[PDB]
């Protein structure tokens, strides 16, 4: 027995890899702000050691602290929210070339937004400020600490 | 058998807590830039699950990828560098109010600088831009991914 990847609690550490990430100029579920996204991203729970592809997770069954994730149906597409404590730390994979989020100046907290089709097609989104790492596609690794439930 | 806390490889995840952190105006082993530092900091290796107090570690025996950490003897004080990939993610403990580093606009990578007395007295330094979390003392939790050896 081990805690599955669809089980999260506050204080967990999430490791996300976004191979061939595309730069989105304005993401709907961020307030129309830039983001990187990949179709075949991978999500890892660092403490437990469990990992799975983002596109192969039933995101309506993912629970944080035993409760379902917050969802936003912007346009006709449903975006799931995975809150973080602190900012999302993303850098170009394999290189020490870091990226900074849109709210680089503020004391706000970031979140991992996922679009899920309902079958097996999921996109992982990371809030960014500009094309500091490139216009895409670019391999990107992220890192974050799982935050509390937005109530 | 388990990998000790004085054993690091690139890609490890470090969880640091800085209880009652003081705001330093200019840190010598940062380019004379602000920092938060704590006397009773704790260091955790998230994947392995090992943790120890920063003041209880022989920092001349801490090895990254089998090689000793880079040291800088600014003034009469020796500071040990633990390189990171990406920026150091630090926030107020227990709250979702996140601090941001000095190089919040650059693609640079941060590091965990440790002053070690040679006995049992160690200070953990986290780069910061201003008193965005306060003048101190303030409980601060940090998060980072261990980077490659600076050659």
């Amino acid at each position, epitope marked *: 027995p081990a805690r599955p990847i669809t089980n999260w609690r506050s204080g967990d550490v999430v490791w996300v890899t976004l191979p061939s990430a595309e*730069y989105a*100029q304005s993401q709907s579920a961020m307030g129309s702000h830039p983001a990187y996204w990949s179709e075949e991203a991978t999500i890892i729970n660092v403490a437990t050691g469990q990992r799975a592809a983002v596109s192969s997770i039933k995101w309506d069954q993912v629970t944080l602290n035993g409760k379902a994730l917050h969802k936003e149906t912007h346009s006709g597409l449903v975006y799931y929210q995975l809150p973080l404590m602190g900012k999302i730390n993303f850098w170009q994979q394999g290189t020490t070339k870091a990226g900074y989020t849109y709210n680089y100046n503020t004391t706000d907290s970031d979140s991992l937004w996922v679009w899920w089709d309902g079958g097996s097609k999921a996109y992982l989104y990371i809030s960014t400020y500009t*094309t500091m790492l*490139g216009a895409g596609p*670019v391999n990107i690794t992220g890192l974050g600490a799982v935050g509390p439930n937005p109530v | 058998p388990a990998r000790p806390i004085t054993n690091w490889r690139s890609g490890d995840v470090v969880w640091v807590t800085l209880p009652s952190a003081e705001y330093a105006q200019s840190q010598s082993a940062m380019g004379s830039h602000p920092a938060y530092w704590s006397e009773e900091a704790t260091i955790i290796n998230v994947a392995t699950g090992q943790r120890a107090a920063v003041s209880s570690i022989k920092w001349d025996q801490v090895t990254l990828n089998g090689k000793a950490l880079h040291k800088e003897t600014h003034s009469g004080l020796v500071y040990y560098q633990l390189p990171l990939m990406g920026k150091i993610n630090f926030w107020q403990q227990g709250t979702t109010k996140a601090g941001y580093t000095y190089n919040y606009n650059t693609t640079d990578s941060d590091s965990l600088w440790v002053w070690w007395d040679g006995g049992s007295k160690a200070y953990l330094y986290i780069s910061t831009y201003t008193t965005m979390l306060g003048a101190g003392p303030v409980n601060i939790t940090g998060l980072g991914a261990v980077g490659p050896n600076p050659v």
Partner: antibody
Amino acid sequence: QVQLVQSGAEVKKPGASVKVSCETSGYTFTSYNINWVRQATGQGLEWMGWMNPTDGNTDYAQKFQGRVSMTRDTSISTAYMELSSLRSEDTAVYYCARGRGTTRFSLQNFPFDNAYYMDVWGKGTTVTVS
Amino acid sequence: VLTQPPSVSAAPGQKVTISCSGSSSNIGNNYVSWYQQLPGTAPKLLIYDNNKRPSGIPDRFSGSKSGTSATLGITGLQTGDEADYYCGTWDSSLSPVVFGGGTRLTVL
């Protein structure tokens, strides 16, 4: 795959206006800027301006401002360029291209870390004037 | 604005480089793409970002950005490399898309 099919060659008198077309396929049309690049025969490439095919927003280079109008038809997924007041130095091949990257441009709003490249090009449209 | 050699020649089996030169607001602050144009053909993306090859571009092509100057590299010259190569980057003062003068890659 993704394609950018343009119109045929045009012969225009000096003083008229030429409208060139660019049909797009294989991708969501209202997702990437449609660029226009000019190249005089014997000269290098020259960016004319992009156009966001979702709000009609366009941004011309500071040489054709007042002589070029870039429109859109999202129903048929066809981008357009118009060039009026055709001078003698306008006999050139006009290219349609799809750009990927940052779209916000101004004199001083984002003066660092700006990546934008033209991924898929057209085939060119030779517009001669005489 | 971006300087570029008018022509570049090399042996049919020799490594050759094509280098541009910009200002602080051209190359030192933004990313520089490279485009290949065969004679009588539309330009084709060769290098995006600074050293990134699209799908289809052989690994012999390479690029690198060091300061306000960036270069285009080749590992081995072939018959089909005889084309015209252009620089492209972001200019925060003039226009988001600026080009170089171009360069002809000939054979000796």
